[PDB]
Design a protein that fits this description.
The structure is cut from a larger assembly and holds one copy of chain A (121 residues), four copies of chain B and one copy of chain D (110 residues). Chain B is 6% helix and 24% strand. Chain B is mostly beta strands and 297 residues long. Chain B is elongated. Chain B starts with a helix and ends in a 7-residue tail after the last strand. The chains are: A mainly beta (121), B mainly beta (297), D mainly beta (110). Bound molecules: 2-acetamido-2-deoxy-beta-D-glucopyranose (NAG) (3 copies).
């Protein structure tokens, strides 16, 4: 499908390093921006960062800079999201969605990943 | 000093006669930097991070002042594609404090970027934006294959001119709906003016305690030089900032962050000579110090 | 850690495309030379322009 | 950072509007304001882009507009399916952040 | 109108201190022995082409610097009163005659391109200079207690930079604000030309004398 | 008299700072060329 897909249900434990992948397919990713969006459950969503697979130019949110690492694997059209120390309070819905320039909005969205990390096994 | 005479005359033999060798200069002790009392950081993010540039037909100029904002972030991290500086240099930008800074902001195609230069011809330079011949600043054509691109329209005129208007008709209303040779980019121009008013935007260099009555190399808002700082009966006018003499020598500068009258007297300098009786007869040497009170050696 | 590895990965921009720079530092003629051009040497001539 | 009416309730067959209120540097700066529909529990979908352009396949009951410092979403003819989260958009230059997101609006229909 | 503008318009060129030296500059100035446009009280709106001097004799309150009034073009409404001076570049709807008093000068003040509010600046004579050079906005104002017997004094008077904050706006016509006290007064109008002058600085740093290089 | 073939591989985009005087990233504290460098810098598309 023409979407930014990810894996299924993800259950893990805090302290491990996890790099989830978002795959792009069905469009000309070279001319468009591709990025991610965070959204806490029951609180307003926050775009975390965005990259341009035309030349792999990286941009992050001030609130979400450095905590996460992304990469546009344009050879296979993949968007990464690297966590070094997953937090218990990190439970939310994460959207990898690709946007546009000039107008600077989002036109296509991914289904999102139910990332729930807690000390319980 | 006999060896000095052997050095200067380029011979192993010297004779009857005083020989000019060099100039006795008193070296500075320790560097002092006196930037104004301001310590805030100016929002260069409100020009470079500002990515909604204004089209060259009617561009936007941002005025900035009253801070010691650092150029290090722009200098070290070369997150651009073209960094052409006329006047200042990317490395020395951190040393000078400027009277005023205007950050011109507009867009232009990937080609004709060389038209952003003093005198360089072209349609954009001929009608849209013409830098003055005596330009002084840095040009940063940082890459926008994803930020610039519709709304960013484009079309002799004075240096730093500005006139937006519309009149077998003829109208210069032209746009560009892009989405690499023809791709438009982002062009930001910093226009500095130095030594014309009280400097207001400075560098990150930490201030250093002032010293007086000693040969000390100094830096007052960028007035690099070495000298001894004394007091003078002259009074700076309240609107005035710093004085000067003939030969553009800044003898008097009202030191910032203290607003104190000062005179930059040059350090103790005196023509050192040699009174030698000639290597044929003797080797004992006498040294002359031209017009120095004995107190200072 | 004072050192990192960029990687210079293959299919990327000119930033990540490695240009294997070889720097040939020469020197002016001030000493005997063990390296010389492929010029075909000839004999010498004395007392003649 | 872009305040919105947190919750909107309305009967089917109603004309409601959402105030995309901001400041003079984010919404009132004159930059474009864009909009979406964030259906609860599913992915968001684009509603309004450019304040006048309409996506393909969208029902005509929804329209977008801007009025100075604030922007308005034109909802004409609410129906029972319109129980969804609705959120703002704009573009901010000087704020470094290429996109800026609204606080959020709940629109509910019984 | 013909009159002798003896030694008006002298001002500090670039805010650089020079003591007991002779310096020649190519700067905008009022030529020595030029003429005035005596006005009273009717105050017709007169143009400001490239450079114009303004003089006067709370009898003058402010000015309107507008290419096209009635909320059409950005204009300077500089007025000195109310214990706080205000200098705006708002798209003022400057009516046929906005006036103070009790205050009614404001008329549709919105969409202000530039803003300036700060501490007020001030047989008594007042002087003012309005120059827009290279995008800078620089004003001058000194006062002289000379008597009213003579139209203008013979002594030399310097002008200091009142405000150095730049604007860079288009101005083509100017009207000053009178004071309808209920006592009429009158004012001069001059002109600035880029003819080169030689500025004689005193040992104390004051501008003592000058010569107009475009004169006899 | 004596020549050398100083050999290294760089980012490619920063071939501009392999010059007598530059202040780039590698030229800071990796390898600085003298202001009186008399030589022939040779670079090619060695990404392959
Ligand atoms: C500016 O933008 C850069 C990347 O373009 C970002 O890393 C930084 O946080 C922003 N802030 C400033 C002060 O430039
Ligand atoms: C040198 O200094 C002394 C005292 O400091 C002063 O008396 C003397 O006049 C100076 N030299 C000359 C030549 O006057
Ligand atoms: C010159 O300055 C002194 C104070 O330094 C002052 O007493 C004197 O009146 C001044 N003279 C002039 C020309 O104003």
């Amino acid at each position: 499908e023409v979407q930014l897909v990810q894996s299924g249900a993800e259950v893990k434990k805090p302290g491990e390093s996890l790099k989830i992948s978002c795959k792009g397919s069905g469009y000309s990713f070279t001319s468009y921006w591709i990025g991610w969006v965070r959204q806490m459950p029951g609180k307003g969503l926050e775009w975390m960062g965005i990259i341009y697979p035309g030349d792999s130019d990286t941009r992050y949110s001030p609130s979400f800079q450095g905590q996460v690492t992304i990469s546009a694997d344009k050879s296979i059209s993949t968007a990464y999201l690297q966590w070094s120390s997953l937090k218990a309070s990190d439970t939310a819905m994460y959207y990898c969605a690709r946007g546009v320039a000039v107008d600077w909005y989002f036109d296509l969205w991914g289904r999102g990943t139910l990332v729930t990390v807690s000390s319980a096994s | 000093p006999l060896s000095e005479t052997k050095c200067t005359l380029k011979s192993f033999t010297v004779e009857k006669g005083i020989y000019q060798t060099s100039n006795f200069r008193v070296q500075p002790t320790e560097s002092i930097v006196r930037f104004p009392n301001i310590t805030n950081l100016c929002p260069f993010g409100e020009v470079f991070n500002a990515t909604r540039f204004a089209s060259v037909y009617a561009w936007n100029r941002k005025r900035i002042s009253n801070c010691v904002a650092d150029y290090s972030v722009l200098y070290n991290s070369a997150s651009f594609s073209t960094f052409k500086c006329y006047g200042v240099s990317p490395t020395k930008l951190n040393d000078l404090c400027f009277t005023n800074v205007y950050a011109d902001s507009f867009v232009i195609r990937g080609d004709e970027v060389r038209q952003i230069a003093p005198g360089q011809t072209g349609k954009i330079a001929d009608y849209n934006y013409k830098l003055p011949d005596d330009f002084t600043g840095c040009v940063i054509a940082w890459n926008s294959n994803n930020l610039d691109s519709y709304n960013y329209l484009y079309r002799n005129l004075k240096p730093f001119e500005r006139d937006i208007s519309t009149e077998n008709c003829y109208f210069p209303l032209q746009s560009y709906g892009f989405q690499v040779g023809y791709q438009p980019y982002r062009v930001v121009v910093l226009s500095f003016e130095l030594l014309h008013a009280p400097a207001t935007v400075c560098g990150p260099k930490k201030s250093t305690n002032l010293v007086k009555n000693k040969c000390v190399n100094f830096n007052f808002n960028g007035l690099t030089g070495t000298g001894v700082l004394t007091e003078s009966n002259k009074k700076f006018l309240p609107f005035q900032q710093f004085g000067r003499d003939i030969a553009d020598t800044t003898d008097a500068v009202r030191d910032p962050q203290t607003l104190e009258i000062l005179d930059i007297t040059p350090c103790s300098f005196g023509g050192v000579s040699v009174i030698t009786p000639g290597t044929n007869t003797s080797n004992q040497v006498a040294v002359l110090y031209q017009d120095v009170n004995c107190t200072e050696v | 850690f004072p050192l990192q590895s960029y990687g210079f990965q293959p299919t990327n921009g000119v930033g990540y495309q490695p240009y294997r720079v070889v720097v040939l530092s020469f020197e002016l003629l001030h000493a005997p030379a063990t390296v010389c051009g492929p010029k075909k040497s000839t004999n010498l001539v004395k007392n003649k322009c | 950072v872009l305040t919105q009416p947190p919750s909107v309730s309305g009967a089917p067959g109603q004309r409601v509007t959402i105030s995309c209120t901001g400041s003079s540097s984010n919404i009132g700066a004159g930059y474009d304001v864009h909009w979406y529909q964030q259906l609860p529990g599913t992915a968001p979908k684009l509603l309004i882009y450019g304040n006048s352009n309409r996506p393909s396949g969208v029902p005509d009951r929804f329209s977008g507009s801007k009025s100075g410092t604030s922007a308005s979403l034109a909802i004409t003819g609410l129906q029972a399916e319109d129980e969804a989260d609705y959120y703002c958009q704009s573009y901010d230059s000087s704020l470094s952040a290429l996109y800026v997101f609204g606080t959020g609006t709940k629109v509910t229909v019984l | 109108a013909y009159t002798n503008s003896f030694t008006r318009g002298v001002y500090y060129p670039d805010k650089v201190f020079r003591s007991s030296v002779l310096h020649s500059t190519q700067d905008l100035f009022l030529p020595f022995f030029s003429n005035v446009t005596w006005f009273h009280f009717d105050n017709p709106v007169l143009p400001f082409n490239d450079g114009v001097y303004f003089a006067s004799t709370n009898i003058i309150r402010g000015w309107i610097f507008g290419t096209t009034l009635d909320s059409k073009t950005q204009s300077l409404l500089i007025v000195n009163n109310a214990t706080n001076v205000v200098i705006k570049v708002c798209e003022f709807q400057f009516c046929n005659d906005p006036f103070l008093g009790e205050f009614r000068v404001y008329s549709s003040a919105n969409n202000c391109t530039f803003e300036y509010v700060s501490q007020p600046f001030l047989k008594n004579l007042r002087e003012f200079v309005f120059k827009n050079i290279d995008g800078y906005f620089k004003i001058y104002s000194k006062h002289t207690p000379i008597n009213l017997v003579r139209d203008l004094p013979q002594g030399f008077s310097a002008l200091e930079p009142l405000v150095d904050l730049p604007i860079g706006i288009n101005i083509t016509r100017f009207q000053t604000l009178l004071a309808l006290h209920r006592g009429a007064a009158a004012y001069y109008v001059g002109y600035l030309q880029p003819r080169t002058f030689l500025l004689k600085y005193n040992e104390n740093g004051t501008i003592t004398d000058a010569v107009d290089c475009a004169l006899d």
